[PDB]
């Protein structure tokens, strides 16, 4: 008996409603997607980092140079452990991937593949916010960001609505790597703003948001 | 005077705002059972069970039925069904999309329903800011084609799609003749989903206007 | 002897595929669906594709979803539904042209395909037929619609040819009469229809042979 | 409105460069490369599915090669001279058809598979290593039978200008279907796998001879008209 809900375990049910505030937001940016020597995903990641630091975030950027393919080495590997620890530190993340062969990169997906959903006592991605972005040498398409939104859902991360797709990125960055004024840059600014907003509005409730009826019900 | 920033040349200094207020509220949850208007529709039954749970969590719920809805632009937007859906969508603070997997993808009914809702009705954005939970029923395996397409669609309706989702495999095995769902892990996941949706709706519905206050739009101060 | 490294196969139902009944104007049906708007750029692109297909030697039909009810909002008796089903059976190849509405295929397009059963008893109206996917958009050149329909082709067991068309800012590419101005977009449409006819000629004669699957023969349960 | 000397209802068609679509040829046993990529796990069910599919392809008359991604660096983490990269590229050229079998890790194809495909340029100067070659997509999963990986790979095939055959394989709870030696237990999943390899060989034989003709596009001929 559970108020016209036959299958519910009455003790494991809880109404959603809490206090708490923090001072800070850790945001890790995964420029992943290109280890290229001039990589526009890297330059876009760094512009996003500038914007996040202006918006009040503490930012770390992981470079996958020397990261082996998933399961090509033992997880003791330094790059793997760096990525896992940085994710642990993260409260939100930024995935910026070029559109290689009409999809997210092998680098991006390899980085996420090295991250366990549950690492012992820690769940490194669950509850953390996520903003997905993509650069492209051609048209403004969304193959990469679409795949990454779905992946975010499989990381039990809160993927923010807004996203940015930079078409023909080589035309938007100078030789130094800074991005020229454009609607693309403004969309990136909107995206980073929204990411910080959503991180502030949720980072305190992550433990409560991940308290699920299913998990409590297995209290048998 | 007043202008200019240190390392970021491209920003319009006045249009920049640090993200940081608002009070509480009462939460409207609109459920679109769309996907099958079949006379025994398992998507309909799952929608109704989700509504039971949502009302148990304290929600005011509306459920729209697409019976008689014409294809997008097959009738004037004056159409009663179209206006009902638009008004309910404005009423909503969060939503539930439950669609079967027809031909390995979301249905034309669901997609037609969303196609009838404009992103911008003049000054109003009917979906922006509202939360969203996507679920799917299937006669076969537990796949995610429909829910994946619907997560992306959520991204295009500027809605906050919650991470968790429900996919009912062999849905015909899970509902009795009355329409109630038998005990299974699927029901537990649906409860998880409605719980998370209500949590996120409460955690955002008061700040929705602030979250959609975007630097680009403020920069559009061209006058 | 009863096999050679493959324990699970029922040896009698196994067949090696070789060269197998060898052939005219290839039926290619175009589903302009995606817009019932009066001025629909998907419609104009569909008609340009039909012009090109007929120049390449095809017999073409174009179905309009005007008045088609939502799937199961009416009995399959509906004239539009049976018209579409019969046209689909007639087809040897198809063209699905959908605008990108809400970043995805339209409800019109998907509703049209939903009215088509994968198997209507013993006959499957989609199996074996070729497919070319194209998309028009009011904005950027994206691929959401063509990607979703490329997958749908696999779920309709249709052979979707590699090349596809994505028309960016279609309003800029069509005059008021509906003809498309010269562009890389039009040339790509021509490439797509050429490839579609090429692949249709290479498959229409083997369609029965290609759909003779080990699973089906193994069910020889007497 | 200067319009060349021929045309008819098609103002935009360059009358020169237009061609009517068609010849016979027998590499008689079709080269089919299988990329077990997706898992370098030591017991990888993707690998075992690849090997059973290879058995079936060889019985149906195909010459088969299987590439293992052990030691392949991430794309652009090393010079393309790297031995692993060059082996993969050469096998790709040798290929007339392919099989992509990837597990569904985190609800999508893996970084291993996509890194392998990212190492293959669409055009290395004048040659296209994937164009025209057939493609069969399959996936293994630790849970239910989903299609995220196979769908992403079906789209990738189009972007690799490959002809992806309709049928596909999705093996649910692969651990339940494989012995300790690596052979697959009898199941509907195995029947689908053979169906897929059958269709792949059928389409490879029906297209490998016309691929050059199939890849002759109005666009390329029209741009080959320079003055």
Residue numbers in the entry:
A (entry chain D): 24 to 40, 45 to 51, 63 to 258
B (entry chain C): 21 to 40, 44 to 49, 63 to 259
C (entry chain A): 23 to 42, 47 to 49, 61 to 259
D (entry chain B): 19 to 40, 46 to 49, 60 to 260
Give verbatim excerpts from the published study on this entry.
Paracoccus denitrificans ArsH is encoded by two identical genes located in two distinct putative arsenic resistance (ars) operons. The X-ray structure of ArsH revealed a flavodoxin-like domain and motifs for the binding of flavin mononucleotide (FMN) and reduced nicotinamide adenine dinucleotide phosphate (NADPH). The protein catalyzed FMN reduction by NADPH via ternary complex mechanism. At a fixed saturating FMN concentration, it acted as an NADPH-dependent organoarsenic reductase displaying ping-pong kinetics.
P. denitrificans ArsH was produced in E. coli as an N-terminal 6xHis tag fusion, purified by affinity chromatography and crystallized by the sitting-drop vapor-diffusion technique. The asymmetric unit of the crystal structure of P. denitrificans ArsH contains four monomers, named A, B, C and D, tightly packed together into a tetramer. A dimer is the usual form of flavodoxins and a dimer of dimers is assumed to be a biological assembly of S. flexneri ArsH. The same holds for P. denitrificans ArsH. The pairs A, B and C, D thus can form structurally cohesive dimers and the dimer–dimer interaction is dictated by the combined A-C and B-D interfaces. Each individual monomer comprises a five-stranded parallel β-sheet surrounded by five α-helices and a short helical loop rich in hydrogen bonds. The structure of the monomer can be divided into two sections, the main body, where the β-sheet and its flaking α-helices are located and where the active site is predicted to be, and the C and N terminals that form a structure binding to the neighbor monomer. The sequence GSLRERSYS located in the β1-α1 loop and N-terminus of α1 (the underlined letters represent the residues conserved in ArsH proteins) matches the consensus site GSXRXXS for binding of the phosphate group of FMN. The β4-α4 loop protruding over the presumed FMN binding site carries residues that are highly conserved among the ArsH proteins and partly conform to the consensus sequence [VICL]-X-[IVC]-X-G-G-X2-[VIL]-[YFA]-X2-[AFMCLV]-[LMIVF] derived from the proteins known to specifically bind NADP+. ArsH appears to be less sensitive towards product inhibition possibly because its two cysteine residues are well separated in the amino acid sequence and located spatially far away from the flavin cofactor-binding region.
